Write a protein that binds this ligand. Sequence first.
Ligand SMILES: Cc1cc2nc3c(=O)[nH]c(=O)nc-3n(C[C@H](O)[C@H](O)[C@H](O)COP(=O)(O)OP(=O)(O)OC[C@H]3O[C@@H](n4cnc5c(N)ncnc54)[C@H](O)[C@@H]3O)c2cc1C
Ligand SMILES: [Cl-]
Lengths: 528, 527
Amino acid sequence: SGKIDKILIVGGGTAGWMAASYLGKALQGTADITLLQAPDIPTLGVGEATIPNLQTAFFDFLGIPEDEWMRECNASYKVAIKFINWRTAGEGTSEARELDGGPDHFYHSFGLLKYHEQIPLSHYWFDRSYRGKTVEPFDYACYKEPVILDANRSPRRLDGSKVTNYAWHFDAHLVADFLRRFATEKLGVRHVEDRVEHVQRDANGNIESVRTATGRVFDADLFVDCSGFRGLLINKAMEEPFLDMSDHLLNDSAVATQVPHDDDANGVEPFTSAIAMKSGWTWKIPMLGRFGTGYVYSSRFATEDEAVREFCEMWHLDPETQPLNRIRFRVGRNRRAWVGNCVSIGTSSCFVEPLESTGIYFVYAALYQLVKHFPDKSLNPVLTARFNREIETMFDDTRDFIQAHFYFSPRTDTPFWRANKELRLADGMQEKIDMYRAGMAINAPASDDAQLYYGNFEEEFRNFWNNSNYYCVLAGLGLVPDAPSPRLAHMPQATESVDEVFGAVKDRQRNLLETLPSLHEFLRQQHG
Amino acid sequence: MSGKIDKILIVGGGTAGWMAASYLGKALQGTADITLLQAPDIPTLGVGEATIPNLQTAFFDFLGIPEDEWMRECNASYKVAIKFINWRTAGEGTSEARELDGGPDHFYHSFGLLKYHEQIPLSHYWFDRSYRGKTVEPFDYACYKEPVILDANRSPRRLDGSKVTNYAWHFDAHLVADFLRRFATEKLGVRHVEDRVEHVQRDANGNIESVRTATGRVFDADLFVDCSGFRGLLINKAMEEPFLDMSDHLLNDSAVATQVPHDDDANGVEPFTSAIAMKSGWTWKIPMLGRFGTGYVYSSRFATEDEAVREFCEMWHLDPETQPLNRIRFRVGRNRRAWVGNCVSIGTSSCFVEPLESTGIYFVYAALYQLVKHFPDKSLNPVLTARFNREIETMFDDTRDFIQAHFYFSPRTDTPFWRANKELRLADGMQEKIDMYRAGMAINAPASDDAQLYYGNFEEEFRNFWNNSNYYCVLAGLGLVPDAPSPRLAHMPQATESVDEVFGAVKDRQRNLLETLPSLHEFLRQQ
Ligand SMILES: Cc1cc2nc3c(=O)[nH]c(=O)nc-3n(C[C@H](O)[C@H](O)[C@H](O)COP(=O)(O)OP(=O)(O)OC[C@H]3O[C@@H](n4cnc5c(N)ncnc54)[C@H](O)[C@@H]3O)c2cc1C
Ligand SMILES: [Cl-]
């Protein structure tokens, strides 16, 4: 019996310091926290893209205003993910190829999808498209974002007012540093820079203590494994099996670097770019004066050298001198994220390519669940089982959504793209696709007020990938319902007034394209 | 083949039938021809129906009917909660609460919303204090302002009309059915045909082609809605869809009921439904205007119809030999599938569970909302049908489990009935909720403690129908509490300290409303 008195976090990367901060804040003065991390070879800041609830679910919980952390972490703004060349054959290039009279790209914005008589706008759009009343792409018809993004507009007016939902772009290293200073200076977390050499377990199989290379021994009531892909505690010591899911996702590697950028001459893109390649895709994460970029590929379809070549050749970099990070990652999740008195947080727990910026999200989402299911020293099995259930559905739902990006691409030009169609969608994903094809909304939000949504975590965790997200991706790639939603034929009054809505977004976007200052313009002011 | 549905035939003209005619008529106004076939049934006494808040927001508001309009025509009263009497003490079936630990044996399950404190339901702070011996006050009186004002039969609205608490209604279903029949036929163009179904003609695909009536008339349609009640004329008889008897979770399958005249001037009116525990079941009391409906829901396995009639009549001091009574044998459970082919079952033809938590009418409009949401065209995409069936299935089973818990967790062991309930098994899904409750976790806590956003948005409420508040009201009320306080609270000394004024605010609302609110009767008079 008794509450948890000591917590030991193993690992000092982004996950480790977010854990120290979140737990240090949530348990302020009722638990002694120590973070243990081995100083080793650091990597290039290849950039990180995020989602809106980073501020409401994480930084707001710590009591850190947006302005404070993003200025210290030299962050930029992200309004969407621009998918480039996912529908056309060809080599890996930063320039969109031509498709049906236009550039091959489509957006997945954080922007809200307007309802109309209890029905998502997406459904009205497809009805008109299917009956030939429109030729306009889904994103440009239902969202105001596409047009102001094509013009690299800021998501905020010079006076600071927000005109749309947005997330952030930043170097993970700087954020980890910011959080380390915060956790140690303001939350009392003890930082020990040493390397774990031996983990001692008791007869119940729980971790008793960890011994470092210098011979120091640390004990705790609860151990948080933030050791990364190695899973030092969860996989190695506790022997919990990692479940590989490469049967759903072929990508398992990446070659990444940071590239200098002339913002003055080219402005700053208010979005992350996902550029389709021959054996994967490449991310582009604009930051201040540079952009992080990385080629995510499948080791089964391209050798590291081929990836290095393809990657450097698209950014016109020199393979021989360009500093490059060659990464190999495991895809999937542990059979159980929390076993005994060991909780895995971060890549030690689960991982999927950054195609939808879920990496950091998985960390604070898991920390939120750990606090919600926080135990005492008796370690009630029920709290552990529930936490584990929340993690598996969180991961598996994203895994499926991401697989859909590859499964439904029309490309058949390379072994990679053709191989993605050979895979099997999880039963849950197949059911969602069937629903989509039948004209149904997928996980429509009970309400269409982003505020409530992006402001209330419980509500967002339960409706993470909603109808808007699915339409952007599926419709963007070319997968559309078999026929218009049956209910529409019974709503003449609705399908008539819907035009007011479509016109409203057209005006909305015409006005923003004229009154909004470029992202660069805003960033200058924003950043001293 | 893919033109929209053009014709719909509703078989059955009771409450479910006219609710369906009204909802579909409103939803598909002018794009579908609706006909309802209704045959004369032997009249029954209006024994009363209790409801929940979303009846107005999810049903009448959808139809565009103001609360005052249907209430006045259906002579309805107000319901603020369900008051459970004598569920924790041994004894005969009586209308008087027995004594338990210094007070009457009752607890309320009201519509009030549990206030969150530092992101944690007030229920957790209450149990923490109770467990540590800091309080001995019951969960409902400590966390809700309703109990105090209900003990005084207060109105949910001030004389000026201002609402002070969430509430639902009490009324004679027959009157609501008539109100809707008139609304649908007069305002929505629904065609009413008084005839009896004699034969249902199906095609080689197993779908219903048409139904032939006793007069020889043949009615064809694209979609058929079975609102024929327990006999499930279409869904069970014609479509042969199996019915899942769930008597392994619910022992009650019968009822004896009547309507009793009441002098509201002399006794006032109770703003709540009473659920009175009996020896082999429980009895409802639904206050209406100048009378109250009441019925003893019992298990034929533990009481004969005669014994049920005697226990029921004696409790109300009525003559068993001459009191007009409605003897009913329920069909408890649900169809394997609510919608099969082009036949959708709505109402008791679809599913039924004893009215212990007032879900009868709710199941009807909730299903109609789900039907429109998954509305098909002539191709009848099987995915719409499957998704519909999953929604209905979970809606029912979750309620089945919730209701079973009322009996499973009662501390009574005085009769074979109460003892047998403890011998049944809880469904795995329910056992998991109990494991969570015992571990100090909230059970399906609402995304937010905003009652309006809750009872105002159906999609929101449907998904979180039985929430943490509902579970604590019933479980803690019966006496089942967590094994220990939520471990999180030990790490929140500031919160467990500042919550003392959240409980104080409740006490202030209890005291102020008790001193300023008129009686339910007073408010009813002025209306
Ligand atoms: C004892 C009892 C207590 C209840 N208490 C509550 C409560 O407190 N609160 C609450 O919300 N709900 C309560 N309910 C549920 C409520 O009564 C029902 O939800 C509602 O009234 C709908 O009944 P129904 O239309 O499904 O079936 P029925 O009333 O059985 O209707 C059958 C209909 O089908 C028709 N029919 C049958 N065969 C044919 C044929 N061959 N041709 C033409 N027509 C045919 C009949 O004419 C009739 O109109 C209670 C139910 C019972 C039995
Ligand atoms: Cl009001």
